[PDB]
Structures are given as C-alpha cells and as structure tokens.
Design a protein around this ligand. Structure first.
Ligand SMILES: [Ca+2]
Ligand SMILES: [Ca+2]
Ligand SMILES: [Ca+2]
Ligand SMILES: [Ca+2]
Ligand SMILES: [Ca+2]
Ligand SMILES: [Ca+2]
Length: 391
C-alpha cells in the first residue's frame, strides 16, 4: 500500500500538495531542518525523486532499545551500585541537578509518569510515535518499562523509597520514540530530537538571542539521551543531530549490545557521546560494542520500572543515563556558579573547557593506559568532573 520516507527539500521549490497529489500523506514537516516525513504509494517514489524541490529521498530505518532484563529490593531507598561507581552522591550538596534552566530529554519507550520515585522530576512528556506528536499522557506512558528504568538511573528522587538517580533533582523530558516492544522508527526519533530542542513551548529560540541550551528564557533541553541504536546513517537524522549539537545540547547514546567493533547509530556520530557498559568488577561487558567514547555501569542495574515498581536491567542502554546524569550535574554546577553552561566539545577534547573534555580527563582510566577500544576514555566520575568544571 504506502511506504514512509523522508525527503530533504529546497523549501522555495517544494510543494507538499504535490505529494498529496500522488496519493501520499504529509506526516511531519520538521521545524528545524528542511525535511518532511511523508507516506507515498510504492509506485510514487520515482515521482517523489523528480518532484521540484526534492533534494534527497531517504527510507525510514529502525532502531531498537538497548536494555534487557538482567534477571527486587527492600522498602527503604537503595543506592544502585552504578550510582556510587560514577561518584555521584558526594556532588549533591553542590547540586543534584535542580538548577531551573537544566532539563534532560530522554528519548525512549515513554515513562511511568506518576511513579512515586520519578513523578516530581517529570517536567514534560511527549510521544512522537508514527510521526503524530502527542502530549496526551495516555500516549506518553511507558508500555515497555525500558524508558522508565533509564529515566530512574538519571533522576530517581533522593528520598526514603525506591532508588536514586545520578542527578536526583534534575528535570526530565520524556520523549517517547519507541513502541511497546522497544522498536522505533528513525523518523520518530528525529521528530523526538526536534521536540527536545523545541521543548514544551514548541519554539526553539523564543527571544531570538541565538542561545538555546542554557538560556533560562527558553525551555530547550541541555542533554538528549538515546538508549537505542540502529544500523543506518541517514542524512536527515544527522542533520537533526547537528541542530541539537549547534543548540549547545550534549547528546549521549548507547554504543550497542552486539560486541560489534564499533558503536551503532546515533552513537557513532562525531557529535554524540557513545557509551559502553562495565560490570560491577570494572570489566567491560562482552556485549558492549567497542570503540565507545566513555563507559559506565551497565550490568545488574536496579532502577524504577512501571507500574510504581523496580527492576534490574542490563545493556549499554543502562550505561548511557549514568553519563547523561553526570553531564546534567556538570552543566547544573557550571551554570549555578557562572550563569552559563559549558560548550559540548568534541570526541577527542582533552581540556576542562568543554563538557566532553571534562568527561574524558576525569574518567577513571581502566584496562590499557589512555583511551582504549573497550572502555573509551574510561568510566565517568561525577565528583571529579564537577571539581574540574568549577576549578
Ligand atoms: Ca533548558
Ligand atoms: Ca528514591
Ligand atoms: Ca522552546
Ligand atoms: Ca534564546
Ligand atoms: Ca535569553
Ligand atoms: Ca584505558
């Protein structure tokens, strides 16, 4: 019948009605890139490619969650091993992430938005599934569990129940881009990245000052966390990754669980921090795809899970939110002190002047000395990173 594609367009020359004319459907017109998600009959893909103003026709590829059940806890608050491993709790007196301009967007299976250990930190929920952007909580709710678990590793509340996140005061945007089985289309994921930049108010840079992340006048997230991965590198997705990066947003993603030689997408992009998984003995997990940028706890990870529950999962998906939490603590501390955020930085940054530079120099260097193919620069450490940021 119909196939989903994403066209990159010249906006002066492209007419969406010409798509409608061939028996297609306009799914989503991106605000931040010159591209449109459309459905067209198979027979019309040729006609699309020749339409005026159509510069590229790309097909809609699939990504999957990167977390699975490993195999449960007392009634009091438990501190999962990985939260102490990334040296987070000592930071909280300085900041636990509750600086008001900071939000972390988690693009995943949705969230148990009323979970007692998460609810006070869930600031906004949206779903982009099938290219239909919804802020109905019933569409945003997690039907899988994975997204709830990831968000609790970042931001579960520090109190007397449940668990606790790396940045337990930080505001979360849950952006639902993966269905009940944890599969997601690249189109929905790119609409999700866009929504994290646009934020609740639907405008990227509302006062027109060119500042998006770290502007208190805007509601852009400062961190986008993607515990998911795909095999394809598509130009429109990368264009959206670059918009986020250029908005000053730190992007973090799981390297993948295939023990493959390099990270999946979007982790593999230069502008994204790829995260590998360690276990509780500081060994790299054998499933962890290699050549990550940093590594973090990703085996036997206890966190929140629907409905008002807790679960132990494993995968590079569980490692990623540890790193996203550390980044939130870095930006929050930096803003608290200076009234601005740090630049994101690059894959090979090695200075205290960028988020990624801090992460790399303060990471616990494991296995062979320096960056290696298993650990990346090593295991992220919040207490040291914040010390570097503020120094
Ligand atoms: Ca913000
Ligand atoms: Ca708690
Ligand atoms: Ca906004
Ligand atoms: Ca602004
Ligand atoms: Ca401003
Ligand atoms: Ca090393």
């Amino acid at each position: 019948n119909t196939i989903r594609v994403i066209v990159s367009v010249d906006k002066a020359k492209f007419n969406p009605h010409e798509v409608l004319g061939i028996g297609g459907h306009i799914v989503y017109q991106f605000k931040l890139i010159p591209a449109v998600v459309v459905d067209v009959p198979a027979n019309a893909v040729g006609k699309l490619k020749k339409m005026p103003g159509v510069e590229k026709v790309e097909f809609d590829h699939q990504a999957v969650l990167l977390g699975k059940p490993s195999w449960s806890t007392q009634p009091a608050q438990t501190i999962p091993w990985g939260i102490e491993r990334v040296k987070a709790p000592s930071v909280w007196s300085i900041t636990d992430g509750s600086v008001s301009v900071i939000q972390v967007a988690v693009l995943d299976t949705g969230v148990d938005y009323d979970h007692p250990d998460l609810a006070a930190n869930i600031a906004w929920c949206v779903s982009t599934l099938r290219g239909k952007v919804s802020t109905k909580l019933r569409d945003c709710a997690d039907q899988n569990g994975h997204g709830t678990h990831v968000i609790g590793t970042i931001a579960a509340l520090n109190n007397d129940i449940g668990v606790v996140g790396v940045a337990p005061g930080v505001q979360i945007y849950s952006v639902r881009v993966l269905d009940a089985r944890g599969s997601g289309s690249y189109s929905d994921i790119a609409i999700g990245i866009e929504q994290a930049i646009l934020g609740p108010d639907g405008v990227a840079d509302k006062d027109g000052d060119g500042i998006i992340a770290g502007d208190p006048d805007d509601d852009a997230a400062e961190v986008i966390s993607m515990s998911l991965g795909g095999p394809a590198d598509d130009s429109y997705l990368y264009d959206m990754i670059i918009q986020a990066y250029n908005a000053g947003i730190v992007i973090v993603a799981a390297s993948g669980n295939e023990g493959a030689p390099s990270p999946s997408y979007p982790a593999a992009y230069p502008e994204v921090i790829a995260v590998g998984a360690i276990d509780s003995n500081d060994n790299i997990a054998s499933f962890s795809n290699r050549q990550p940028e940093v590594s973090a706890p990703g085996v036997d990870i206890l966190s929140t899970y629907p409905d008002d529950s807790y679960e132990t999962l494993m995968g590079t998906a569980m490692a990623t939110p540890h790193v996203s939490g550390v980044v939130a603590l870095i930006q929050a501390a930096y803003y608290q002190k200076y009234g601005k955020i740090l630049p994101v930085g690059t894959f090979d940054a090695i200075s205290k002047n960028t988020v990624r530079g801090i992460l790399h120099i303060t990471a616990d260097d494991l296995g062979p000395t320096g960056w290696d193919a298993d650990y990346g620069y090593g295991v992220v450490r919040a207490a040291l990173a914040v010390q570097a940021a503020l120094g």
